[PDB]
């Protein structure tokens, strides 16, 4: 069919550059990719690769002169072997060419992919495996011609062993052409995988829209609104995962987060499978927020509206107004994708679409029409774990305590929490089958276990890019998730009591919640869809794959010296509840949640070019605290760090005067410099103090009471000599030589005294000790 072959053309039309940079054939890489797809068809390959060489030769318009040189070569070829028409095979080479210009957004010197966060730096060519290598942008160094030949060797190996199909070639070109630059120039920050992933997307949307070969020649497909940018966004995530009462200790929370991502994939894959789009049309799908390029046809605007009408009515019946999916679309044209002149059109048609998302979230369930309709149902009851009221008798006795009467959608998640260690992805099948635990809005999801056979037309596979035990006819969809979890003595998930007992000192539970700051301004800078598709994969990969390898103790040259209470274990007791693409909510031991927040920050500082920041709230809680309360506190400790500087951490709850001159949260370099001064003199490592301070906590607790006299009146200077007397009579005039004398320059600069910021370093150590 022309449908798959157009998407396979644009996803291989740019293929051949890696054989130019290697040096296999003579130049003008369009001629090379013809011969490379020619030679691939001969030995261990079908004859279909010979016809796909036409797309890898007749792009850039350097050879297709006066339209007649294309015909004499293809008149020799017989399209009757594939059922293609002599004019329809002529049609798809024109579609790929216009889709090639509507993606780059526009040769000498082989330049390695430059960094999208700072174009002054660049990436060494690596393998996308998320294991042992954090690609940190270093100084500019050209890739050797010896190094591109090894790229061709594995790519020759993988393309002969993979099925020639739209979904089977995408994890091939992703693992190998991610860190290969598309157009070699000064500061190329668009990848070659992403340039082909957005050339194949625009070529398929043109074919569904019905533009033919003379429409491309006449310049008619551009300056005419034929595409359509779909965008969706889940509203109410944080009151959906965490808002449960004191049941389901964290095996269930990790199951609420995996079931959120299944609702997002069920809606996205339904749009693709109904409009005829491949997975390359997904621009991104990162933390409950997706974006798809499609065609602007009446057979799709009608067909998208039935998807939104069904999915919202599903979300309202199951989760009663606690989660809403705002889906919108906006018709765009050819020139709207690229930068036209001096004004960014793609960032303007994205901010027209983002306004239609904003006004749709204010009309939160307009498409129900029985929304404000009252009614009386007998025996209404509340399911104890997640605040959902059901008709009497609907809740089925639970598997935890059979006296309790939970709703049945929570027993599908307790049972899901017992299989998440032994899980290799999901299978998407019909609603009404057996083996289904949880159903989405459009499908039911069967857990594909470790040792077993999957079932479904579409198989979602987590955290890898290799379809090993999958049937050849089943559609392969890879996804990624941050899935680190401290195990119990069995092969499961630990507890709010088990994580709180392997912590040094006091037995509290530590919670961090962070997100990237001013990120909407970063993605608004992208002016072309291939450039957005690069910046939204690299940001997605830090919170999906590389946040696992930070907890795994790697990357010591990059991280360095961070404030650690105890030395770093081989197996950290960390349970990553959620990590979405900017946001992450991680619980664990309060000593290792403290250290990891400085360890995530330093690696994110170097994964970018030092341009994007974090902000982390940190809480320390009782074990037997309801989890909707531990979220509502740390969400306030995150937003307190967020309205102040957006590069700063909230460490410990702290007293300060209401004069507006004192702020509770530390900047990252300030606290990490306060730790290199004050901690190596009072703290030895692993929950013990230094010499001459053992059995002298009574110095330190009273030192905080002297800090309370600064809190009661900062203008009173009584704290200055009481520090000098209390350090004096213990003989510790060497320790803390600046808490005795008032800083006049700090009163000049209108910044707080050093007695005020010492609380965040002492109180962590006093909590580290038995206290």
């Amino acid at each position: 069919e022309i449908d798959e072959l157009t998407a396979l053309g644009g996803l291989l039309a740019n293929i051949g550059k890696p054989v130019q940079r290697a040096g296999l054939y003579s130049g003008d890489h369009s001629t090379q990719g013809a011969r490379f797809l020619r030679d691939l068809a001969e030995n261990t390959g079908r004859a279909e690769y010979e016809l796909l060489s036409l797309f890898s030769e007749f792009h850039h318009k350097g050879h297709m002169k006066n339209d007649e040189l294309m015909i004499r070569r293809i008149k020799e070829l017989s399209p009757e072997r594939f059922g293609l028409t002599m004019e329809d095979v002529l049609n798809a080479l024109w579609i790929v060419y216009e889709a090639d210009n509507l993606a780059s957004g526009e040769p000498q010197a082989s330049r390695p992919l430059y960094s999208v966060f700072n174009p002054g730096k660049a990436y060494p060519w690596a393998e996308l495996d998320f294991e042992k290598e954090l690609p940190v942008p270093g100084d500019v160094f050209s890739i050797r011609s010896q190094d591109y030949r090894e790229l061709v060797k594995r790519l020759w190996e993988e393309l002969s062993k993979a099925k020639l199909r739209s979904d089977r070639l995408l994890p091939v070109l992703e693992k190998y052409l991610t860190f290969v630059s598309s157009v070699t120039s000064e500061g190329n920050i668009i990848s070659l995988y992403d340039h082909m992933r957005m050339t194949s997307a625009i070529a398929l949307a043109m074919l569904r829209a019905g533009c033919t070969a003379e429409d491309v020649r006449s310049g008619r497909c551009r300056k005419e609104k034929r595409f359509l940018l779909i965008e969706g966004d889940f509203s109410g995530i944080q009151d959906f995962i965490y808002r449960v009462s004191g049941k389901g200790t964290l095996k269930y929370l990790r199951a609420r987060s995996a079931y959120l991502e299944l609702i997002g994939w069920d809606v996205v894959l339904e749009i693709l499978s109904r409009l005829g789009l491949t997975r390359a049309n997904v621009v991104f799908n990162a933390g409950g927020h997706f974006m798809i390029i499609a065609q602007n046809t009446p057979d799709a605007v009608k067909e998208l509206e039935e998807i939104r009408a069904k999915a919202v009515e599903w979300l309202y019946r199951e989760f009663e107004s606690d989660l809403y999916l705002a889906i919108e679309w906006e018709p765009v044209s050819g020139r709207e994708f690229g930068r036209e002149g001096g004004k960014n059109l793609f960032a303007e048609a994205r901010k027209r679409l983002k306004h239609k998302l904003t006004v749709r979230k204010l009309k939160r369930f307009g498409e129900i029409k029985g929304l404000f309709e009252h009614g009386h149902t007998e025996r209404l009851a509340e399911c104890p774990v997640c605040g959902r009221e059901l008709p009497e008798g609907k809740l089925e006795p639970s598997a935890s305590d059979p006296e309790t009467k939970v709703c049945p959608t929570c027993n599908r998640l307790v049972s899901l929490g017992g299989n998440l260690p032994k899980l290799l992805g999901f299978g998407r099948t019909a609603k009404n089958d057996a083996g289904v635990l949880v159903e989405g809005p459009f499908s039911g999801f069967v857990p594909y276990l470790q040792g077993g056979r999957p079932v479904g037309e579409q198989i979602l596979v987590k955290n890898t890019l290799n379809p090993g035990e999958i049937p050849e006819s089943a559609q392969f969809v890879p996804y990624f998730v941050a899935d680190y979890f401290k195990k119990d003595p069995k092969g499961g998930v630990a507890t709010f009591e088990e994580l709180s007992m392997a912590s040094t000192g006091t037995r509290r539970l530590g919670v961090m919640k962070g997100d990237v700051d001013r990120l909407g301004e970063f993605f608004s800078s992208m002016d072309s869809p291939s450039k957005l598709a690069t910046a939204s994969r690299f940001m997605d990969y830090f919170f999906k794959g590389y946040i696992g390898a930070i907890i795994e103790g790697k990357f010591g040259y990059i991280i360095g010296d961070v404030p650690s209470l105890r030395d770093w274990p081989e197996e950290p007791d960390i349970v990553v509840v959620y990590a979405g693409g900017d946001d992450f909510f991680i619980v664990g031991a309060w000593d290792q949640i403290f250290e990891l927040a400085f360890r995530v920050r330093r690696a994110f500082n170097a994964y970018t070019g030092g341009k994007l920041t974090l902000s982390v709230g940190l809480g320390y809680f009782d074990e037997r605290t309801p989890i909707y309360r531990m979220a509502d506190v740390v969400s306030e400790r995150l937003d307190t760090a967020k309205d102040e500087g957006r590069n700063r951490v909230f460490v410990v709850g702290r007293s300060r005067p209401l004069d507006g001159k004192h702020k509770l949260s530390y900047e990252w370099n300030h606290y990490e410099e306060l730790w290199r001064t004050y901690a190596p003199r009072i703290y030895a490592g692993n929950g013990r103090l230094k010499g001459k301070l053992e059995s002298k906590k009574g110095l330190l607790w009273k030192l905080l009471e002297i800090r309370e006299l600064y809190v009661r009146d900062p203008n009173d200077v009584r704290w200055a000599y009481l520090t000098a007397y209390l350090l004096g009579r213990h003989g510790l005039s060497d320790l803390f030589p600046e808490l005795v004398g008032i800083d006049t320059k700090a009163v000049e600069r209108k910044e707080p005294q050093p007695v005020y910021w010492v609380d965040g370093v002492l109180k962590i150590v006093l909590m580290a000790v038995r206290r």
């Binding site: 607790w701 009273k702 009471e705 800090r707 309370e708 109180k763 006093l766 206290r771």
Partner: protein, 278 residues
């Protein structure tokens, strides 16, 4: 039906350091108002200590009170702790999480029990609401001014644990309120029935009279309670007060009287107009 609200104002005198912990820079902090930083006595630490003293008082007098209060005939003195079965024959009949409390199981029985008629009951298909409201006691204006004058309002006391053989000392610290403080309490009784409110006031004063010889919160057996009720005024707030708003409530006058010069010293005398207007 509503008839009025007997209002009990006065002061709480912490004759000895009073400690009501929170377990959250002193190692064991008394609770505090988060905006001022001042300590206070809750209305829930005061009420559960008025109730725990009064339930053991009723527990000793189950047999002698079978014919003044019914539904004390369905209770045997003792706990239901060994045989883990709630609402059994014994008195402390409801298990909450791990503790056993006398709570009567129905509305029809809590209207007769002297504890639950005054202090309330949960039940199944019952929900008997209490008749008293116990407010949070805060420091008196004279003691908020000492907070302004730079004094200490909560000391920190160090104890120690000592081996009986080798005298190894093992200390800890406990923050507690400086002895001598004056709080301001408030108890608003709700006159639902017009017959048995004398028995509900005289039982509330008995719970306070046992509280002046027991302790309030904290360590207590090591001398951290020693509380004292200093009454100021009792007011009636009639039903005619709430409709028309004109100030004709009946006010008792007791500036310096005890909890035992008030129970029977003046009970026929101080409530003379309240027992007349009913």
């Amino acid at each position: 039906r509503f008839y009025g609200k007997i209002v009990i104002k006065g002061k709480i005198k912490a004759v000895t350091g009073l400690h009501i912990g929170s377990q959250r820079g002193i190692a064991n902090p008394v609770i505090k108002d988060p905006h001022t930083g001042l300590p206070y006595i809750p209305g829930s630490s005061l009420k559960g200590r008025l109730r725990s003293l009064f339930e053991i008082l009723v527990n000793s007098r189950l047999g002698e009170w079978r014919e003044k209060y019914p539904s004390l005939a369905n209770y045997s003195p003792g706990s239901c702790r060994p045989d883990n079965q709630e609402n059994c024959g014994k008195f402390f009949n409801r298990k909450i999480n791990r503790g056993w409390i006398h709570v009567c199981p129905d509305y029809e029985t809590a209207l007769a029990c002297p504890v639950c008629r005054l202090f309330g009951a949960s039940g199944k298909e019952s929900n008997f609401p209490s008749r008293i409201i116990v407010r949070d006691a805060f420091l008196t204006k004279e003691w908020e001014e000492k907070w302004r004058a730079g004094e200490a309002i909560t000391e920190a006391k160090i104890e120690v644990g000592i081996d009986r053989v080798t005298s190894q000392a093992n200390p800890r610290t406990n923050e507690r309120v400086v002895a001598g403080a004056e709080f301001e309490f408030e108890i608003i009784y709700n006159v639902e029935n017009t017959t048995h409110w004398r028995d509900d006031i005289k039982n509330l004063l008995t719970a306070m009279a046992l509280l002046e010889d027991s302790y309030l919160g904290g360590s207590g057996s090591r001398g951290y309670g020693k509380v004292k009720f200093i009454f100021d005024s009792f007011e009636f707030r009639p039903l005619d007060y709430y409709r028309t708003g004109k100030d004709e409530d009946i006010v008792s006058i007791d500036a310096r009287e005890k909890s035992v010069s008030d129970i029977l010293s003046g009970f026929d005398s101080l409530f003379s107009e309240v027992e007349g207007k009913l």
